Amino acid sequence: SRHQFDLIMCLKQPGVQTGLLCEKCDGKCPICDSYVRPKRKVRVCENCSFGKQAKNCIICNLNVGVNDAFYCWECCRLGKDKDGCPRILNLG
Amino acid sequence: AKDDELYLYHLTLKKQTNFVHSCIGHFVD
Amino acid sequence: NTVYVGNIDPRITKEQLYELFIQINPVLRIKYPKDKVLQAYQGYAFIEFYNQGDAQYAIKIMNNTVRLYDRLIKVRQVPIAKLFIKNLADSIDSDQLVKIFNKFGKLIREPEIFYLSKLKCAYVYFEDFEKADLAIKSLNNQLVANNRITVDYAFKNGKGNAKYGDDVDRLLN
Amino acid sequence: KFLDEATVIGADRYGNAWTLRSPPECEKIMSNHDPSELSNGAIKYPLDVITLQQKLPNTYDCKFKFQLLNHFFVNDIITDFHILDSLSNSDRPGCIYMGLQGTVGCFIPLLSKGNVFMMGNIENIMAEADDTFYLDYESRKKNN
Amino acid sequence: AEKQRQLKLQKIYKQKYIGLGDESTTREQWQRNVRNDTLNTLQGHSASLEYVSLSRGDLSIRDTRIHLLKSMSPGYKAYLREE
Amino acid sequence: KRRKTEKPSLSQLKSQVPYPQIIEWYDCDARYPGLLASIKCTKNVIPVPSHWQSKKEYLSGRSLLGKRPFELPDIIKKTNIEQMRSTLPALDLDYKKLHDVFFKIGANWKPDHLLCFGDVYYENRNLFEETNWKRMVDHKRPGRISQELRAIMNLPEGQLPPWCMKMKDIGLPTGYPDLKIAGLNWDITNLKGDVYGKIIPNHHRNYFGALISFETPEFE
RNA sequence: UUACUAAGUCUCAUGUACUACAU
RNA sequence: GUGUAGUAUCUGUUCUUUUCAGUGUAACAACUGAAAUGACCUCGAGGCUC
């Protein structure tokens, strides 16, 4: 993540699925963790969804998220939107 | 002081004519 | 191009110098030092013009002209053969050395008499490596004033190398 | 091509349509001096220019630089620019270009300001308009 | 830790985007990336592809496109030499 | 070892270069020196800032001790909040005032210094003195002397500078052929105040983008 | 008329801030 | 107004085996290995010295 360093990402070709984030993490752009003017919903590779792990918050990787994560307009222009599958594999 | 700052308005009068792709489907009825 | 200026009051500032000399010519650059031991101005500056024409012009018109803080402002514009000679006689005067080496070559400066060990030695400056070779060829291991003198190149290790003939030839040119 | 004395139109092999302008520091010098003194003779350049000559001789060799004035990208490769004092008697002189892959387009200088202010606001609208539709469609899904 | 992550992201970005100069990269390795991307865009834009087709004067345009594709590999020079 | 001793001389490298004076002694150990000379000496490239090879972390500067904390841009200083809130060791303001300062008053406003294409800021540099310098090359012109430098010079009003007499024998400044000075080439009765002379130019648009009107967005 | 650059490493002391941790 | 552990930053101080070779370095630095003993000449320098 932008702040916590040891957090590792996925970075695969995103699928059709949309990543979920919990109400606790709601509002953060999964890359920069910004609250401003979100744009496009996150898309994750199928390898990050499958079973129960699909329900996890793509940000904090623990809680079960209801909400969809959106990229901000700064990351959508920086292109990090399309970089790959954001997810946090290690808890940190 | 007057700012030069030329403000240009781009228009495409006639649109690019070299046809690079095609498809055979039936789209609208 | 660049002119030295001196006898400046530390109260004279950079903008004051600029406004002063722009009256004379256009000023490309001004280096006006600021002491790191007095935290002010050390009272002399350097004004780089756009050419030595305006530089020399400002030297002519500006010198002994402007009076700043009652003090006058001053303006001023901003490699040879050497032979060591050992065992000279005590009766050998420097002018006598001049006479001896003039026949071989023109001297760019005067000889330097010094004592080693008791041992009277001198440095003789020739304008030409070849004339130096002449004074060497004729005067090496010779008896003058009933004393045997040795004439060779002075150390820098000693002069007379291969690059030395090449570059000294050019400095002659 | 030239729009003017001090400005230039140019295209790219890669499709950029740009226009450059000489800096006023250069325009003052050439307006106030004869060209014969440029190559040899006395032309007094501000301190910064010379320091850019000894500091960066490769870039500043020509002792001035074009400040970017207009830049644009038309995905075609522009063959011919022509500057027309009037297009069908219109007051604002335009510049029309034909591209290689074929196209003809124009750059109209906008008089006043609120012309380019209103135009700029409309372009800003249509720019993210797809995102505005997506955020409305998102909020209605939050309510439903 | 942070730099150590930058190493892994160096491996991933290098894998996806092919040539990315890391610290020491030979001029042969990097210039190859230059040639590959330049040719890539020349053939990639139908625009510049149409352009190179005429300026080169080939009989067909796809000759220029597949030419650039072939020109991406180093051995294509010797290949032309053997024709 | 052998590769370290295999290196060509920097002067051998100069000949390959169209602008040889940029190349430096450390370019000898460039792993690809013939290439690095071409890149570094290419037209528009801007050489690396030289604060590398110093261990001072780019700022040890003694000059950094004497840098001013900050100065408001005069247009913003017009807004008077300087007096309303004392930053040095509540103030009700008008929306129209502030908005107009940025837009109505300050639309055409731009910082005076900025920097150029290849300007790079080295540690010892301070832009402010060069700002007063550029502004000063603007205000000050020959033939005019401020009252301060005039008082220091001890030149009373109505009297010509001391270099006008030596300029009578030597002649006009070679750098200023068009310069005029009272009493010599120029009318002494036009001598006024701080100006004893002026350059007389012998030389005697719309730029396709002339807006012909300026209208800023209104807050109300 | 002086044409603009010095501290570094070690050692044993002094100057000053600070970070977890306990009453 | 205290104690436990620990950190950073000044300043003072001072110059570590004379050399060689390797690593290392942008070059340094730093690191890694070994070790001359004797005689002579001129003004710490120098030796196609033995």
mmCIF file of N, CA and C in Angstrom, chain D residues 13-125:
data_model
loop_
_atom_site.group_PDB
_atom_site.id
_atom_site.type_symbol
_atom_site.label_atom_id
_atom_site.label_comp_id
_atom_site.label_asym_id
_atom_site.label_seq_id
_atom_site.Cartn_x
_atom_site.Cartn_y
_atom_site.Cartn_z
ATOM 1 N N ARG D 13 5.496 13.865 -37.348
ATOM 2 C CA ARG D 13 5.384 12.536 -37.920
ATOM 3 C C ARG D 13 4.460 11.644 -37.112
ATOM 4 N N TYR D 14 4.338 11.903 -35.815
ATOM 5 C CA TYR D 14 3.549 11.084 -34.914
ATOM 6 C C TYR D 14 2.165 11.657 -34.632
ATOM 7 N N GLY D 15 1.821 12.808 -35.203
ATOM 8 C CA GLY D 15 0.474 13.348 -35.121
ATOM 9 C C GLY D 15 0.269 14.498 -34.156
ATOM 10 N N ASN D 16 1.317 15.131 -33.644
ATOM 11 C CA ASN D 16 1.117 16.290 -32.789
ATOM 12 C C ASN D 16 0.974 17.549 -33.633
ATOM 13 N N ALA D 17 -0.043 18.342 -33.327
ATOM 14 C CA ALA D 17 -0.234 19.641 -33.949
ATOM 15 C C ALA D 17 0.074 20.713 -32.918
ATOM 16 N N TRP D 18 1.180 21.422 -33.113
ATOM 17 C CA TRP D 18 1.641 22.391 -32.134
ATOM 18 C C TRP D 18 1.874 23.740 -32.792
ATOM 19 N N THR D 19 1.989 24.759 -31.948
ATOM 20 C CA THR D 19 2.299 26.118 -32.363
ATOM 21 C C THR D 19 3.206 26.739 -31.314
ATOM 22 N N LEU D 20 4.302 27.349 -31.753
ATOM 23 C CA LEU D 20 5.313 27.873 -30.846
ATOM 24 C C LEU D 20 5.448 29.371 -31.043
ATOM 25 N N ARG D 21 6.025 30.042 -30.056
ATOM 26 C CA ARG D 21 6.189 31.483 -30.078
ATOM 27 C C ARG D 21 7.546 31.859 -29.503
ATOM 28 N N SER D 22 8.196 32.771 -30.144
ATOM 29 C CA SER D 22 9.442 33.318 -29.635
ATOM 30 C C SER D 22 9.176 34.133 -28.375
ATOM 31 N N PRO D 23 10.075 34.106 -27.396
ATOM 32 C CA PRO D 23 9.822 34.811 -26.145
ATOM 33 C C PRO D 23 9.909 36.313 -26.336
ATOM 34 N N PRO D 24 9.162 37.078 -25.534
ATOM 35 C CA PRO D 24 9.243 38.541 -25.635
ATOM 36 C C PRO D 24 10.642 39.079 -25.408
ATOM 37 N N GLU D 25 11.473 38.375 -24.638
ATOM 38 C CA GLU D 25 12.859 38.795 -24.471
ATOM 39 C C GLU D 25 13.591 38.790 -25.803
ATOM 40 N N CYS D 26 13.283 37.819 -26.660
ATOM 41 C CA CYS D 26 13.854 37.807 -27.998
ATOM 42 C C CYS D 26 13.179 38.811 -28.921
ATOM 43 N N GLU D 27 11.856 38.957 -28.829
ATOM 44 C CA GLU D 27 11.162 39.903 -29.696
ATOM 45 C C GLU D 27 11.608 41.338 -29.453
ATOM 46 N N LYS D 28 11.864 41.706 -28.197
ATOM 47 C CA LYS D 28 12.392 43.038 -27.919
ATOM 48 C C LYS D 28 13.748 43.231 -28.582
ATOM 49 N N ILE D 29 14.608 42.214 -28.501
ATOM 50 C CA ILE D 29 15.958 42.342 -29.038
ATOM 51 C C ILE D 29 15.918 42.477 -30.555
ATOM 52 N N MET D 30 15.154 41.614 -31.224
ATOM 53 C CA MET D 30 15.130 41.693 -32.680
ATOM 54 C C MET D 30 14.339 42.889 -33.184
ATOM 55 N N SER D 31 13.361 43.361 -32.421
ATOM 56 C CA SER D 31 12.663 44.577 -32.806
ATOM 57 C C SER D 31 13.541 45.805 -32.625
ATOM 58 N N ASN D 32 14.425 45.788 -31.632
ATOM 59 C CA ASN D 32 15.252 46.939 -31.300
ATOM 60 C C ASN D 32 16.644 46.878 -31.914
ATOM 61 N N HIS D 33 16.979 45.809 -32.633
ATOM 62 C CA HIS D 33 18.318 45.658 -33.177
ATOM 63 C C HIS D 33 18.250 45.181 -34.618
ATOM 64 N N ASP D 34 19.353 45.392 -35.334
ATOM 65 C CA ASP D 34 19.516 44.934 -36.708
ATOM 66 C C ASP D 34 20.106 43.536 -36.719
ATOM 67 N N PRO D 35 19.719 42.692 -37.675
ATOM 68 C CA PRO D 35 20.245 41.319 -37.700
ATOM 69 C C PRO D 35 21.751 41.241 -37.865
ATOM 70 N N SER D 36 22.369 42.231 -38.513
ATOM 71 C CA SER D 36 23.805 42.182 -38.762
ATOM 72 C C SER D 36 24.615 42.120 -37.477
ATOM 73 N N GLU D 37 24.054 42.589 -36.365
ATOM 74 C CA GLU D 37 24.810 42.610 -35.120
ATOM 75 C C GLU D 37 24.680 41.297 -34.359
ATOM 76 N N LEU D 38 23.816 40.391 -34.823
ATOM 77 C CA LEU D 38 23.623 39.132 -34.112
ATOM 78 C C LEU D 38 24.836 38.221 -34.247
ATOM 79 N N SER D 39 25.240 37.921 -35.484
ATOM 80 C CA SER D 39 26.360 37.015 -35.708
ATOM 81 C C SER D 39 27.643 37.581 -35.120
ATOM 82 N N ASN D 40 28.020 38.778 -35.552
ATOM 83 C CA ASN D 40 29.149 39.490 -34.983
ATOM 84 C C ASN D 40 28.690 40.907 -34.680
ATOM 85 N N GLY D 41 29.351 41.526 -33.722
ATOM 86 C CA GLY D 41 28.957 42.831 -33.244
ATOM 87 C C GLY D 41 28.332 42.752 -31.862
ATOM 88 N N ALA D 42 27.921 43.916 -31.374
ATOM 89 C CA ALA D 42 27.508 44.088 -29.987
ATOM 90 C C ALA D 42 25.993 43.966 -29.883
ATOM 91 N N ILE D 43 25.536 42.908 -29.222
ATOM 92 C CA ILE D 43 24.151 42.755 -28.796
ATOM 93 C C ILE D 43 24.163 42.374 -27.326
ATOM 94 N N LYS D 44 23.500 43.176 -26.500
ATOM 95 C CA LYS D 44 23.583 43.015 -25.056
ATOM 96 C C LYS D 44 22.436 42.124 -24.597
ATOM 97 N N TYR D 45 22.761 40.948 -24.189
ATOM 98 C CA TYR D 45 21.953 39.870 -23.645
ATOM 99 C C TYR D 45 21.961 39.905 -22.123
ATOM 100 N N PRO D 46 20.804 39.702 -21.499
ATOM 101 C CA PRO D 46 20.749 39.655 -20.034
ATOM 102 C C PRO D 46 21.664 38.571 -19.484
ATOM 103 N N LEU D 47 22.032 38.744 -18.215
ATOM 104 C CA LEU D 47 23.040 37.891 -17.592
ATOM 105 C C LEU D 47 22.660 36.418 -17.674
ATOM 106 N N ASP D 48 21.363 36.122 -17.592
ATOM 107 C CA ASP D 48 20.928 34.731 -17.540
ATOM 108 C C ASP D 48 21.234 34.005 -18.843
ATOM 109 N N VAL D 49 21.064 34.686 -19.977
ATOM 110 C CA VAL D 49 21.231 34.028 -21.269
ATOM 111 C C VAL D 49 22.661 33.534 -21.441
ATOM 112 N N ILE D 50 23.639 34.389 -21.137
ATOM 113 C CA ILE D 50 25.038 34.000 -21.280
ATOM 114 C C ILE D 50 25.369 32.852 -20.336
ATOM 115 N N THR D 51 24.949 32.969 -19.074
ATOM 116 C CA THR D 51 25.161 31.876 -18.128
ATOM 117 C C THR D 51 24.524 30.583 -18.614
ATOM 118 N N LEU D 52 23.467 30.675 -19.420
ATOM 119 C CA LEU D 52 22.925 29.475 -20.040
ATOM 120 C C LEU D 52 23.765 29.049 -21.235
ATOM 121 N N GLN D 53 24.547 29.972 -21.800
ATOM 122 C CA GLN D 53 25.430 29.590 -22.899
ATOM 123 C C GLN D 53 26.637 28.811 -22.393
ATOM 124 N N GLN D 54 27.315 29.317 -21.357
ATOM 125 C CA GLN D 54 28.433 28.545 -20.816
ATOM 126 C C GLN D 54 27.949 27.376 -19.975
ATOM 127 N N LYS D 55 26.824 27.530 -19.282
ATOM 128 C CA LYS D 55 26.307 26.418 -18.496
ATOM 129 C C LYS D 55 25.772 25.296 -19.373
ATOM 130 N N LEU D 56 24.895 25.607 -20.320
ATOM 131 C CA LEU D 56 24.270 24.594 -21.170
ATOM 132 C C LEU D 56 24.463 24.988 -22.623
ATOM 133 N N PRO D 57 25.659 24.772 -23.166
ATOM 134 C CA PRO D 57 25.909 25.185 -24.553
ATOM 135 C C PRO D 57 25.128 24.385 -25.574
ATOM 136 N N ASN D 58 24.774 23.134 -25.272
ATOM 137 C CA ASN D 58 24.099 22.311 -26.268
ATOM 138 C C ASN D 58 22.666 22.770 -26.512
ATOM 139 N N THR D 59 21.900 23.011 -25.449
ATOM 140 C CA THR D 59 20.506 23.406 -25.627
ATOM 141 C C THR D 59 20.393 24.872 -26.023
ATOM 142 N N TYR D 60 21.122 25.745 -25.334
ATOM 143 C CA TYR D 60 20.990 27.189 -25.478
ATOM 144 C C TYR D 60 21.920 27.766 -26.537
ATOM 145 N N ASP D 61 22.563 26.909 -27.334
ATOM 146 C CA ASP D 61 23.414 27.382 -28.424
ATOM 147 C C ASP D 61 22.720 28.471 -29.240
ATOM 148 N N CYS D 62 21.415 28.325 -29.478
ATOM 149 C CA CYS D 62 20.692 29.329 -30.255
ATOM 150 C C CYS D 62 20.224 30.485 -29.383
ATOM 151 N N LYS D 63 20.609 30.487 -28.105
ATOM 152 C CA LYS D 63 20.519 31.583 -27.122
ATOM 153 C C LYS D 63 19.089 31.991 -26.795
ATOM 154 N N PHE D 64 18.087 31.442 -27.470
ATOM 155 C CA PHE D 64 16.710 31.600 -27.023
ATOM 156 C C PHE D 64 16.011 30.258 -27.157
ATOM 157 N N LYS D 65 14.773 30.213 -26.680
ATOM 158 C CA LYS D 65 13.990 28.989 -26.649
ATOM 159 C C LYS D 65 12.533 29.318 -26.911
ATOM 160 N N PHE D 66 11.857 28.426 -27.621
ATOM 161 C CA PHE D 66 10.422 28.574 -27.812
ATOM 162 C C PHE D 66 9.677 28.115 -26.573
ATOM 163 N N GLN D 67 8.944 29.032 -25.958
ATOM 164 C CA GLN D 67 7.970 28.659 -24.950
ATOM 165 C C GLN D 67 6.810 28.006 -25.682
ATOM 166 N N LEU D 68 6.400 26.833 -25.216
ATOM 167 C CA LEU D 68 5.274 26.161 -25.836
ATOM 168 C C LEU D 68 4.047 27.054 -25.738
ATOM 169 N N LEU D 69 3.391 27.269 -26.871
ATOM 170 C CA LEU D 69 2.225 28.138 -26.935
ATOM 171 C C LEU D 69 0.935 27.345 -27.060
ATOM 172 N N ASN D 70 0.793 26.579 -28.135
ATOM 173 C CA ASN D 70 -0.319 25.656 -28.277
ATOM 174 C C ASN D 70 0.228 24.269 -28.552
ATOM 175 N N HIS D 71 -0.427 23.265 -27.980
ATOM 176 C CA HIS D 71 -0.094 21.894 -28.320
ATOM 177 C C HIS D 71 -1.384 21.102 -28.416
ATOM 178 N N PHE D 72 -1.378 20.104 -29.289
ATOM 179 C CA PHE D 72 -2.578 19.341 -29.578
ATOM 180 C C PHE D 72 -2.139 18.018 -30.181
ATOM 181 N N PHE D 73 -3.020 17.028 -30.155
ATOM 182 C CA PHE D 73 -2.753 15.748 -30.794
ATOM 183 C C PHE D 73 -3.911 15.375 -31.702
ATOM 184 N N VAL D 74 -3.656 15.348 -33.002
ATOM 185 C CA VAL D 74 -4.596 14.793 -33.965
ATOM 186 C C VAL D 74 -3.982 13.510 -34.501
ATOM 187 N N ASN D 75 -4.681 12.392 -34.302
ATOM 188 C CA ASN D 75 -4.089 11.082 -34.552
ATOM 189 C C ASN D 75 -3.631 10.901 -35.991
ATOM 190 N N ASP D 76 -4.025 11.787 -36.899
ATOM 191 C CA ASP D 76 -3.520 11.731 -38.258
ATOM 192 C C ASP D 76 -2.144 12.381 -38.343
ATOM 193 N N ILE D 77 -1.566 12.329 -39.535
ATOM 194 C CA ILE D 77 -0.287 12.962 -39.812
ATOM 195 C C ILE D 77 -0.559 14.121 -40.752
ATOM 196 N N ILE D 78 -0.331 15.335 -40.267
ATOM 197 C CA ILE D 78 -0.772 16.515 -40.997
ATOM 198 C C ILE D 78 0.146 16.737 -42.188
ATOM 199 N N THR D 79 -0.442 16.756 -43.381
ATOM 200 C CA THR D 79 0.298 17.063 -44.598
ATOM 201 C C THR D 79 0.440 18.563 -44.804
ATOM 202 N N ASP D 80 -0.674 19.279 -44.911
ATOM 203 C CA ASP D 80 -0.613 20.679 -45.302
ATOM 204 C C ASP D 80 -1.370 21.578 -44.335
ATOM 205 N N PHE D 81 -0.656 22.545 -43.768
ATOM 206 C CA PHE D 81 -1.265 23.681 -43.095
ATOM 207 C C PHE D 81 -1.426 24.829 -44.076
ATOM 208 N N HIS D 82 -2.513 25.576 -43.925
ATOM 209 C CA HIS D 82 -2.708 26.826 -44.649
ATOM 210 C C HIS D 82 -3.392 27.812 -43.717
ATOM 211 N N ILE D 83 -2.853 29.021 -43.652
ATOM 212 C CA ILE D 83 -3.399 30.074 -42.812
ATOM 213 C C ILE D 83 -4.235 30.986 -43.690
ATOM 214 N N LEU D 84 -5.539 30.975 -43.466
ATOM 215 C CA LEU D 84 -6.472 31.752 -44.259
ATOM 216 C C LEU D 84 -6.926 32.960 -43.458
ATOM 217 N N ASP D 85 -6.695 34.152 -44.015
ATOM 218 C CA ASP D 85 -7.079 35.378 -43.327
ATOM 219 C C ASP D 85 -8.571 35.391 -43.015
ATOM 220 N N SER D 86 -9.379 34.740 -43.846
ATOM 221 C CA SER D 86 -10.801 34.597 -43.576
ATOM 222 C C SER D 86 -11.280 33.286 -44.180
ATOM 223 N N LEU D 87 -12.199 32.638 -43.473
ATOM 224 C CA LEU D 87 -12.870 31.447 -43.967
ATOM 225 C C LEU D 87 -14.312 31.819 -44.274
ATOM 226 N N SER D 88 -14.639 31.906 -45.560
ATOM 227 C CA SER D 88 -15.957 32.337 -46.010
ATOM 228 C C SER D 88 -16.348 33.663 -45.354
ATOM 229 N N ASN D 89 -15.467 34.649 -45.518
ATOM 230 C CA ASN D 89 -15.628 36.027 -45.061
ATOM 231 C C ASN D 89 -15.587 36.170 -43.546
ATOM 232 N N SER D 90 -15.475 35.076 -42.793
ATOM 233 C CA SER D 90 -15.457 35.165 -41.341
ATOM 234 C C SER D 90 -14.307 36.043 -40.863
ATOM 235 N N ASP D 91 -14.535 36.739 -39.746
ATOM 236 C CA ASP D 91 -13.540 37.679 -39.241
ATOM 237 C C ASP D 91 -12.308 36.966 -38.699
ATOM 238 N N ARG D 92 -12.502 36.021 -37.786
ATOM 239 C CA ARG D 92 -11.384 35.330 -37.144
ATOM 240 C C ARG D 92 -10.600 34.517 -38.162
ATOM 241 N N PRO D 93 -9.340 34.856 -38.437
ATOM 242 C CA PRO D 93 -8.566 34.069 -39.404
ATOM 243 C C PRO D 93 -8.263 32.689 -38.844
ATOM 244 N N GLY D 94 -8.539 31.664 -39.643
ATOM 245 C CA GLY D 94 -8.297 30.300 -39.237
ATOM 246 C C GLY D 94 -7.067 29.708 -39.903
ATOM 247 N N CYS D 95 -6.662 28.550 -39.393
ATOM 248 C CA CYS D 95 -5.633 27.729 -40.021
ATOM 249 C C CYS D 95 -6.221 26.341 -40.208
ATOM 250 N N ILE D 96 -6.228 25.877 -41.452
ATOM 251 C CA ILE D 96 -6.827 24.602 -41.814
ATOM 252 C C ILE D 96 -5.720 23.666 -42.275
ATOM 253 N N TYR D 97 -5.822 22.400 -41.893
ATOM 254 C CA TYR D 97 -4.804 21.409 -42.191
ATOM 255 C C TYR D 97 -5.458 20.183 -42.804
ATOM 256 N N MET D 98 -4.790 19.599 -43.790
ATOM 257 C CA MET D 98 -5.149 18.297 -44.323
ATOM 258 C C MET D 98 -4.123 17.277 -43.860
ATOM 259 N N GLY D 99 -4.618 16.181 -43.286
ATOM 260 C CA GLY D 99 -3.787 15.095 -42.825
ATOM 261 C C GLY D 99 -3.496 14.087 -43.925
ATOM 262 N N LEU D 100 -2.484 13.259 -43.664
ATOM 263 C CA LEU D 100 -2.064 12.277 -44.656
ATOM 264 C C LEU D 100 -3.101 11.180 -44.825
ATOM 265 N N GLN D 101 -3.526 10.578 -43.715
ATOM 266 C CA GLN D 101 -4.523 9.511 -43.698
ATOM 267 C C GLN D 101 -5.851 10.092 -44.160
ATOM 268 N N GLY D 102 -5.848 11.404 -44.312
ATOM 269 C CA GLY D 102 -6.908 12.218 -44.841
ATOM 270 C C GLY D 102 -7.738 12.733 -43.696
ATOM 271 N N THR D 103 -7.983 14.036 -43.743
ATOM 272 C CA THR D 103 -8.755 14.806 -42.782
ATOM 273 C C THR D 103 -8.523 16.253 -43.177
ATOM 274 N N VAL D 104 -9.433 17.138 -42.813
ATOM 275 C CA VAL D 104 -9.189 18.569 -42.840
ATOM 276 C C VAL D 104 -9.823 19.140 -41.587
ATOM 277 N N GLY D 105 -9.060 19.930 -40.853
ATOM 278 C CA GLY D 105 -9.523 20.472 -39.594
ATOM 279 C C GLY D 105 -8.964 21.863 -39.415
ATOM 280 N N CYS D 106 -9.475 22.557 -38.415
ATOM 281 C CA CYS D 106 -9.141 23.961 -38.271
ATOM 282 C C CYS D 106 -8.858 24.302 -36.824
ATOM 283 N N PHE D 107 -8.044 25.330 -36.633
ATOM 284 C CA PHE D 107 -7.804 25.909 -35.319
ATOM 285 C C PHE D 107 -8.235 27.368 -35.392
ATOM 286 N N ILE D 108 -9.305 27.706 -34.682
ATOM 287 C CA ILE D 108 -9.827 29.067 -34.715
ATOM 288 C C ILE D 108 -9.355 29.809 -33.474
ATOM 289 N N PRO D 109 -8.608 30.895 -33.612
ATOM 290 C CA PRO D 109 -8.306 31.721 -32.445
ATOM 291 C C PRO D 109 -9.573 32.354 -31.897
ATOM 292 N N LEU D 110 -9.748 32.230 -30.587
ATOM 293 C CA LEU D 110 -10.930 32.749 -29.915
ATOM 294 C C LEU D 110 -10.666 34.167 -29.442
ATOM 295 N N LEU D 111 -11.486 35.098 -29.913
ATOM 296 C CA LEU D 111 -11.422 36.478 -29.463
ATOM 297 C C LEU D 111 -11.993 36.557 -28.052
ATOM 298 N N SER D 112 -11.688 37.651 -27.359
ATOM 299 C CA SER D 112 -12.078 37.887 -25.973
ATOM 300 C C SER D 112 -11.597 36.788 -25.037
ATOM 301 N N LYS D 113 -12.410 36.473 -24.032
ATOM 302 C CA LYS D 113 -12.061 35.413 -23.094
ATOM 303 C C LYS D 113 -13.240 34.482 -22.864
ATOM 304 N N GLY D 114 -14.356 35.024 -22.365
ATOM 305 C CA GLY D 114 -15.482 34.182 -21.990
ATOM 306 C C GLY D 114 -15.947 33.276 -23.113
ATOM 307 N N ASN D 115 -15.508 33.553 -24.339
ATOM 308 C CA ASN D 115 -15.584 32.538 -25.383
ATOM 309 C C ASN D 115 -14.847 31.274 -24.959
ATOM 310 N N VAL D 116 -13.556 31.393 -24.638
ATOM 311 C CA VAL D 116 -12.788 30.210 -24.267
ATOM 312 C C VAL D 116 -13.114 29.780 -22.844
ATOM 313 N N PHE D 117 -13.738 30.657 -22.057
ATOM 314 C CA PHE D 117 -14.183 30.249 -20.731
ATOM 315 C C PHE D 117 -15.409 29.353 -20.824
ATOM 316 N N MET D 118 -16.398 29.755 -21.625
ATOM 317 C CA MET D 118 -17.580 28.925 -21.823
ATOM 318 C C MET D 118 -17.225 27.643 -22.563
ATOM 319 N N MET D 119 -16.459 27.764 -23.651
ATOM 320 C CA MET D 119 -15.992 26.574 -24.356
ATOM 321 C C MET D 119 -15.226 25.648 -23.425
ATOM 322 N N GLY D 120 -14.331 26.209 -22.613
ATOM 323 C CA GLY D 120 -13.569 25.389 -21.689
ATOM 324 C C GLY D 120 -14.451 24.684 -20.681
ATOM 325 N N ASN D 121 -15.486 25.374 -20.199
ATOM 326 C CA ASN D 121 -16.397 24.743 -19.252
ATOM 327 C C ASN D 121 -17.209 23.638 -19.910
ATOM 328 N N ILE D 122 -17.620 23.832 -21.163
ATOM 329 C CA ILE D 122 -18.374 22.793 -21.855
ATOM 330 C C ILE D 122 -17.499 21.574 -22.107
ATOM 331 N N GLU D 123 -16.260 21.793 -22.550
ATOM 332 C CA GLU D 123 -15.330 20.683 -22.727
ATOM 333 C C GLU D 123 -15.081 19.965 -21.409
ATOM 334 N N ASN D 124 -14.943 20.718 -20.319
ATOM 335 C CA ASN D 124 -14.783 20.091 -19.012
ATOM 336 C C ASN D 124 -15.999 19.249 -18.655
ATOM 337 N N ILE D 125 -17.202 19.737 -18.963
ATOM 338 C CA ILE D 125 -18.405 18.932 -18.758
ATOM 339 C C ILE D 125 -18.298 17.622 -19.525
#
